[PDB]
Paper text:
The SARS-CoV-2 spike (S) glycoprotein is the main target for inducing neutralizing antibodies. RBD recognizes the main cellular receptor Angiotensin-converting enzyme 2 (ACE2), triggering entry by endocytosis and S2-catalyzed fusion with endosomal membranes, thereby establishing infection. The S conformation of RBD is in a dynamic equilibrium between either all RBDs in a closed, receptor-inaccessible conformation or one or two RBDs in the “up”, receptor-accessible, conformation. Up to 90% of the neutralizing antibody responses generated upon SARS-CoV-2 infection and vaccination target RBD, which is highly immunodominant.
In order to steer the immune response away from RBD epitopes to more conserved domains, we generated S glycoprotein trimers without RBD and stabilized them by formaldehyde cross-linking. The S glycoprotein construct ‘6 P’ without RBD (SΔRBD) was expressed in mammalian cells and purified by Ni2+-affinity and size exclusion chromatography (SEC). Because SΔRBD showed a Tm of 44.5 °C in comparison to 63.4 °C for S ‘6 P’, SΔRBD was stabilized by chemical cross-linking with 4% formaldehyde (FA). FA-SΔRBD revealed an increased Tm of 56.3 °C, indicating successful stabilization by cross-linking. Negative staining electron microscopy analyses demonstrated the native prefusion conformation of FA-SΔRBD, and its structure was subsequently solved at 3.2 Å resolution by cryo-electron microscopy confirming the prefusion S conformation. The structure revealed one major cross-linking site between residues R1019 of the central S2 helix and/or S2 K776 and S2 HR1 K947 from neighboring protomers, which stabilized S in the prefusion conformation. We show that the structure of S without RBD folds into the prefusion S conformation, which was stabilized by crosslinking, revealing one major site that crosslinks inter S2 subunits as reported for complete S56. FA SΔRBD was incubated with liposomes (Phosphatidylcholine 60%, cholesterol 36%, DGS-NTA 4%), and efficiently captured via its C-terminal His-tag. In summary, we show that SΔRBD VLPs are highly immunogenic and effectively redirect the immune response away from immunodominant RBD.
Numbering used by the authors:
A (entry chain A): 304 to 337, 530 to 620, 641 to 676, 689 to 722
B (entry chain B): 723 to 825, 854 to 941, 943 to 1100
C (entry chain A): 950 to 1147
C-alpha cells in the first residue's frame, strides 16, 4: 500500500502449478464410462473409479495388498492409487505450489528486482536453485560478502556492481588466527573510551 | 555440568487460501466477505519467522571475527578434543555436537533458517577458539593471547583462590577437567538429556498435526469435502455449507496463530536468556551464584544443537572440608590484628 | 516496530468493520431498513459475531504485546538499576568493552542508554612466565603478570602495559622452584636491603 519500497524481501503472491489435462480411468471392462490414457510425471486432474483429485502421478514402490485399492497418508489424504486396468501403484504428489517473494533494493536506488519462488524447482516455472527455492533475476557470485538481504539457507542477495542484484553465500566475518603459544602474552599499551 | 536452552523454532508459513478453500474459486469469493484475516495471519507468521532468525543471530553471532585454534594442541595438559571440531568429519562438528544432533501439503510450508547448521558450527568454533586462546579478552576488545595455564590461574583468582594453587596442582586439575569432559560425553551418549528443547519440537509438531486434522471435521456441515458440497447442492445451500466450513477452518487457523505467537514469545525469552549466558558465562567469568552451574564458575564452552544451544559449565567445587578453631582477631601487644584476606585458624596448638 | 505494530493492529480492527462476514451488507442501518425483524435479526447476529470475533482477536494480540513490552520494561529497569546507578561487571550487559558508566535519555515510549566503556586499543607481544625463582623460592605476582621484552623481566597490570621492577612487595612467595612448570630464574629486588646497607 505504498508508492515507495524499502530494501528487503517481500512476500507478494502465491505460485501454483496448474493441471495440464484430466485423466479418467476405469477397469478393463466398462466402469460406466470411457477411460483415458494414463499420464505420468505431470500435474493432471485424475479420476480413478470415482476417486477424484489433482496431482502428479508417479510410479510407486509401495506394495498394496490384493484387496487394497487406495492408499492414505498419516493425515488420511490420498497418497497413492492402484490403476484399475493395469495393477500398478501410482503415487500422487500435490502439484507444486509455494510463495512468491520479491527481492528489491530500495526504490530510491533502482527499480531492478529479483523473484524468489519458495520451495519449488524452477524447471517447473540468471536462474539459481537454492534450498530456499529458485531465484530468478539474480546473478550467482562465488565471492562471499556480508548478508545484505537474507534469502535463506545461508544465501543472501545485494545490489552490487553495471549494477545488478547478486546472490551469494553470506560471510560470517573476517578470519583471524590467534598467535597462541605457551609463553607469549599480548598486553594493551593504549586504550579508547567508547560510547 | 550441561545446560540446554532452546533458541528458535520451525519457521512455518500457511497459505490460508489453500488451507480453507483449496481449489475453489467460489469458496475464495466467500472468503473475501470475511475481510483481511488472511493478510493478518500471514503477517503474524512472517513476523514469527523473522524473530526466529533474529533469535539465532543474537545467541550465536556475538563474535566479531572467526578465530581458529593453533595447529599445535599444547594447552598445558588440557584436552579439548571432545569439544573442538573434528577436522576429518565433512561437517566440522565436535563429538559432543555429533551426539547432540544424533539424538502436510494443505498450504503448509517450512522456510529454511537463514543460518545453516554449518554456519552455527562455525560460530561455535570461533567462540571456542577465542575462549581457549585469549580468555575473555576477545569479548571486550582486541583478542589478546595468553597461555591457557595462566588463564586458568586468573580464573582461580576470580573465585578467591590464590593462583599458586593452580600452578602447584596443574596436572591434577588437567586430569580432573579431562575426566569431567569424558563423563559429559558418556552421559550424553547414554542419556532424555535434551529436555525443554524436545518439548518445544513436540509442541510444534502437535500443533501442526492438530491444524491438519481439523480439516477433516465438519463443524456441523453435511460433509468435510468442499467439492462434495459443491457438486451435491445448489448454490443457495452450498454457500451456507461452505460458509460453515469456512468459519470452522478460519477459527482453527486463528487458534493456531495465537498459540504460535505465545510460543514465539516464550522462545524469545529463552533466546534472550541464552544470549545473556553466552555473554556473561562464555565471554567472561560470572560471579552470579548458580547462574553457570553449581560451584564457583571457572568458564564455559558453547555447543550447537538442533534449534538450541548447550553450555558446558566448568566450575570449582570444594571437596574435603576439615574442622578448625577460629577467632575474629588476635592480640599481640594490646592491638587487635585482623587478616588482610583469609581467616585465623587453629589445629589446637 | 512496536509503534508500527500497534498502528497496524488498530488499522486492521477498523477495516474489519467494512466486511460483511456473509451478511447482505456491512451497514447496520441498511439491514434494519431493508429487512423485516425476523431476517434483520439473523443478519445483525452474523455481523455481531464477526465484529465480536475481531475485537477478541485484537484484545488477545494486545495482551501478548503487553506481556512482551512488560518484559522489555523489566529489562530496561534492570539496566537502569545496574548500569546507571552503578558499575556492572556483567560482560556485554552494558555494551562492548569494560563498563565505566551509563547515561539515560528519554524517548517516545522508550529509554535510551549511552554506555561509556573502556576498550583496550594497542596490544603488544611479550614473553611471560607463571612464576620466578630468586633463592629457590617461587614468587607469584600479587596482581598482574610477569612480562619480558627479551632482556629484562617486569611486573605489569593485566589491562594496561605499565612495567615495574619485580620486588618482594609486588610479589608473594609460595612453595619452591621444583613444582611450577615453566618457572624462570631472575632477581627479586628487596627494598629493605639498601636501607640496611645505608
Amino acid at each position: 500500500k505504498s508508492f515507495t519500497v524499502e530494501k528487503g524481501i517481500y512476500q507478494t503472491s502465491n505460485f501454483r502449478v496448474q493441471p495440464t489435462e484430466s485423466i479418467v480411468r476405469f477397469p478393463n471392462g466398462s466402469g460406466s464410462g470411457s477411460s483415458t490414457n494414463l499420464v505420468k510425471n505431470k500435474c493432471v486432474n485424475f479420476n480413478f473409479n470415482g476417486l477424484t483429485g489433482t496431482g502428479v502421478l508417479t510410479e510407486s514402490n509401495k506394495k498394496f495388498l490384493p484387496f487394497q485399492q487406495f492408499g492414505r497418508d498419516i493425515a488420511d489424504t490420498t497418497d497413492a492409487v492402484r490403476d484399475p486396468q493395469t495393477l500398478e501403484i501410482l503415487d500422487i504428489t500435490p502439484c507444486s505450489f509455494g510463495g512468491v517473494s520479491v527481492i528489491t533494493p530500495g526504490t530510491n536506488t533502482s527499480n531492478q528486482v529479483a523473484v524468489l519462488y519458495q520451495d519449488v524447482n524452477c524447471t517447473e516455472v540468471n536462474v539459481f536453485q537454492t534450498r530456499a527455492g529458485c531465484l530468478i533475476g539474480a546473478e550467482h557470485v562465488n565471492n562471499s560478502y556480508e548478508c545484505d538481504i537474507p534469502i535463506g539457507a545461508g544465501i543472501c542477495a545485494s545490489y552490487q556492481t553495471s549494477q545488478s542484484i547478486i546472490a551469494y553465500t553470506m560471510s560470517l566475518g573476517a578470519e583471524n588466527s590467534v598467535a597462541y603459544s605457551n609463553n607469549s602474552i599480548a598486553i594493551p599499551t593504549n586504550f579508547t573510551i567508547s560510547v | 555440568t550441561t545446560e540446554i536452552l532452546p533458541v528458535s523454532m520451525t519457521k512455518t508459513s500457511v497459505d490460508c487460501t489453500m488451507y480453507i478453500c483449496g481449489d475453489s474459486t467460489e469458496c475464495s469469493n466467500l472468503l473475501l466477505q470475511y475481510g483481511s484475516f488472511c493478510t493478518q495471519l500471514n503477517r503474524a507468521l512472517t513476523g514469527i519467522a523473522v524473530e526466529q532468525d533474529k533469535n539465532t543471530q543474537e545467541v550465536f553471532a556475538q563474535v566479531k571475527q572467526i578465530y581458529k585454534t593453533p595447529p599445535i594442541k599444547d594447552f598445558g595438559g588440557f584436552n579439548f578434543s571432545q569439544i573442538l571440531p573434528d577436522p576429518s568429519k565433512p561437517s566440522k562438528r565436535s563429538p559432543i555436537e555429533d551426539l547432540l544432533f544424533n539424538k502436510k501439503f494443505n498450504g503448509l510450508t517450512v522456510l529454511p533458517p537463514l543460518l545453516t547448521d554449518e554456519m552455527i558450527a562455525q560460530y561455535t568454533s570461533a567462540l571456542l577458539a577465542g575462549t581457549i586462546t585469549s580468555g575473555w579478552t576477545f569479548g571486550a576488545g582486541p583478542a589478546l593471547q595468553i597461555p591457557f595455564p595462566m588463564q586458568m590461574a586468573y580464573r582461580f583468582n576470580g573465585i578467591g583462590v590464590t593462583q599458586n594453587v593452580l600452578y602447584e596442582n596443574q596436572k591434577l586439575i588437567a586430569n580432573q577437567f579431562n575426566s569431567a569432559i569424558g563423563k559429559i560425553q558418556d552421559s550424553l551418549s547414554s542419556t532424555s538429556a535434551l529436555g525443554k528443547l524436545q518439548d518445544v519440537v513436540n509442541q510444534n509438531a502437535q500443533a501442526l498435526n492438530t491444524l491438519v486434522k481439523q480439516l477433516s471435521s465438519n463443524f456441523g456441515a453435511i460433509s468435510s469435502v468442499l467439492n462434495d458440497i459443491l457438486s451435491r447442492l445448489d448454490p443457495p445451500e452450498a454457500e451456507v455449507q461452505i460458509d460453515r466450513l469456512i468459519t470452522g477452518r478460519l477459527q482453527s487457523l486463528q487458534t493456531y496463530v495465537t498459540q504460535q505467537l505465545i510460543r514465539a514469545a516464550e522462545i524469545r525469552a529463552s533466546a534472550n536468556l541464552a544470549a545473556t549466558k553466552m555473554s556473561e558465562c562464555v565471554l567472561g567469568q560470572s560471579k552470579r551464584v548458580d547462574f553457570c552451574g553449581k560451584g564457583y564458575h571457572l568458564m564455559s564452552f558453547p555447543q550447537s544443537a538442533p534449534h538450541g544451544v548447550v553450555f558446558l559449565h566448568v566450575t570449582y567445587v570444594p571437596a574435603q572440608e576439615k574442622n578448625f578453631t577460629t577467632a575474629p582477631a588476635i592480640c599481640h601487644d594490646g592491638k587487635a590484628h585482623f587478616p588482610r584476606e583469609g581467616v585465623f585458624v587453629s589445629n589446637g596448638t | 516496530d512496536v509503534v508500527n505494530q500497534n498502528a497496524q493492529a488498530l488499522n486492521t480492527l477498523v477495516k474489519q468493520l467494512s466486511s460483511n462476514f456473509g451478511a447482505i451488507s456491512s451497514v447496520l442501518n441498511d439491514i434494519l431498513s431493508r429487512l423485516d425483524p425476523p431476517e434483520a435479526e439473523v443478519q445483525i447476529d452474523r455481523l455481531i459475531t464477526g465484529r465480536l470475533q475481531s475485537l477478541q482477536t485484537y484484545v488477545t494480540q494486545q495482551l501478548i504485546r503487553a506481556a512482551e513490552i512488560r518484559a522489555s520494561a523489566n529489562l530496561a529497569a534492570t539496566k537502569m538499576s545496574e548500569c546507571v546507578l552503578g558499575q556492572s561487571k556483567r560482560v556485554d550487559f552494558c555494551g562492548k568493552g569494560y563498563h565505566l558508566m551509563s547515561f539515560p535519555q528519554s524517548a517516545p515510549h522508550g529509554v535510551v542508554f549511552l554506555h561509556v566503556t573502556y576498550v583496550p586499543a594497542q596490544e603488544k607481544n611479550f614473553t611471560t612466565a607463571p612464576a620466578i625463582c630468586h633463592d629457590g623460592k617461587a614468587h607469584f605476582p600479587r596482581e598482574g603478570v610477569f612480562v619480558s621484552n627479551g632482556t629484562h623481566w617486569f611486573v605489569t597490570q593485566r589491562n594496561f602495559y605499565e612495567p615495574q621492577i619485580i620486588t618482594t612487595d609486588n610479589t608473594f612467595v609460595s612453595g619452591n622452584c621444583d613444582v611450577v612448570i615453566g618457572i624462570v630464574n631472575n632477581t627479586v629486588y628487596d627494598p629493605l636491603q639498601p636501607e640496611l646497607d645505608s
